[PDB]
């Protein structure tokens, strides 16, 4: 049995209703029960059972979750989406062996625009003893995801020695954070004075620069 979930991604504003669907390639209902179950997987965590047998909420699961359907077509509804609902949702049948899973639906939350708060960290003395200097620029709690970070050393635009990582949406406030790390040799680090991170984001009317002066 093949389970087809739709949509692949669902973007909703906070508090709006979310409905995702799962279609089985054949009927998974008896007279008394339907053998479809729904799981929620939040980032970094194992899947968690939310709804068993199409519509029975698992213990502890909040009341805004419900499920419905019979035969081939099943739906999971969140009546009012909260930040904690950010997750991938998977359906699974138990009609027969083998059980199979749907492909998942990723639920995204379109919260209000928020500019990043920007912070910069020089290399630790502990790291400098090792011969390398990492400089870290943090863009915290912003929305939406699109952001540009550029590194300047003594006012010169850097290319080719930084790496970025972005978090998934935060489970409490739906924002992103981003880190940009500039990696230099200690010798090169010690040859320059001003280290700056320049941040562009749509929540800001001009780029924001955070900097420090070595020594």
């Amino acid at each position: 049995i093949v389970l087809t979930q739709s949509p692949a991604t669902l973007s909703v504003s906070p508090g709006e209703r979310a409905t995702i669907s799962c279609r089985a390639s054949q009927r998974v209902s008896s007279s008394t029960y339907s053998y479809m179950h729904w799981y929620q997987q939040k980032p970094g965590q194992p899947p968690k059972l939310l709804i068993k047998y199409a519509s029975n909420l698992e213990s502890g699961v909040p009341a805004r979750f419900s499920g419905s359907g019979s035969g081939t077509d099943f739906t999971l509804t969140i009546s009012s989406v909260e930040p904690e609902d950010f997750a991938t949702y998977y359906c699974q049948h138990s009609w027969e062996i083998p059980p199979t899973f749907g492909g998942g639906t990723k639920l995204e939350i379109k919260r209000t625009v928020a500019a990043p708060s920007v912070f910069i960290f020089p290399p630790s003395d502990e790291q400098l003893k090792s011969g390398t200097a990492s400089v870290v620029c943090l863009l915290n709690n912003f929305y939406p995801r699109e952001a540009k970070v550029q590194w300047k050393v003594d006012n010169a635009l850097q290319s080719g020695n930084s790496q970025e990582s972005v978090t998934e949406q935060d489970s409490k406030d739906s924002t992103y954070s981003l880190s940009s790390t500039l990696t230099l040799s200690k010798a090169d680090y010690e040859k320059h004075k001003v280290y700056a991170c320049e941040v562009t984001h749509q929540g800001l009317s001009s780029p924001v620069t955070k900097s420090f002066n070595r020594g």
Partner: protein, 219 residues
């Protein structure tokens, strides 16, 4: 009260085998089927198979019938999965999960990330990202730990042994040009707090049996 505790992440060489464990507690182990589930990184869930711990009967997704062997040790309340002759497609998180009546999967282990690679395990270095006048914002201060030069994934980070979770952001790893990974974990706290509160990052890299606690103090 149901807990399923799986073995730690590890690297396995191409062509080698691995035996994964899943220790159960808080219920009568022989009373529930044990399922195993694969999740390749960035992908969905796939069922591997089941074992009845009472009679040892198994059933497999056909894709895994030659890959996976399931056993149980009744006395030890432990289920095992052995994966044969590993290749790159076998890199994944493997979960054990208890089945309620062979229908739904109601309790899950934390997953074991198996990385199939000929590269060596390496534990990380941990460096403080200390709060300073350049990491303040609106009366708040940011601090963190940089977790550098480890292999394979994953590293986990907690703060103050799990008592500090609000405002923590632990970034996904980046792959360095060296082929080693790096990540940072940060937190925002009141600036007013920095003289009186203690902030410790707890870093774990199970493949290398690395645990580091690092006190992050104002510079």
């Amino acid at each position: 009260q149901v807990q399923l505790v799986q073995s730690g992440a590890e690297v396995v060489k191409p062509g080698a085998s691995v035996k994964l464990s899943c220790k159960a507690s808080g219920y009568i182990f022989t009373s529930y089927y044990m399922y195993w589930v694969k999740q390749a990184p960035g992908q969905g869930l796939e069922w591997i198979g089941e074992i009845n711990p009472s009679n040892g009967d198994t059933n497999f997704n056909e894709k895994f019938k030659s890959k996976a062997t399931l056993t149980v040790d009744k006395s030890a309340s432990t289920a095992y999965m052995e994966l044969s002759s590993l290749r790159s497609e076998d890199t994944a998180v493997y979960y054990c999960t208890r089945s309620d009546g062979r229908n739904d999967m109601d309790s899950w282990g934390q997953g074991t990330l198996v990385t199939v690679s000929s590269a060596s395990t390496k534990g990380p270095s941990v460096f403080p990202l200390a709060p300073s006048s350049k990491s303040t914002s609106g009366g708040t201060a940011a601090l963190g730990c940089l977790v550098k030069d480890y292999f394979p994934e994953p590293v986990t980070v907690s703060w103050n042994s799990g008592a500090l979770t609000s405002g923590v952001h632990t970034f996904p790893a980046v792959l360095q040009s060296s082929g080693l990974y790096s990540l940072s974990s940060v937190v925002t706290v009141p600036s007013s707090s920095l003289g009186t509160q203690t902030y410790i990052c707890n870093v774990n890299h199970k493949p290398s049996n690395t645990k580091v606690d690092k006190k992050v103090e104002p510079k």
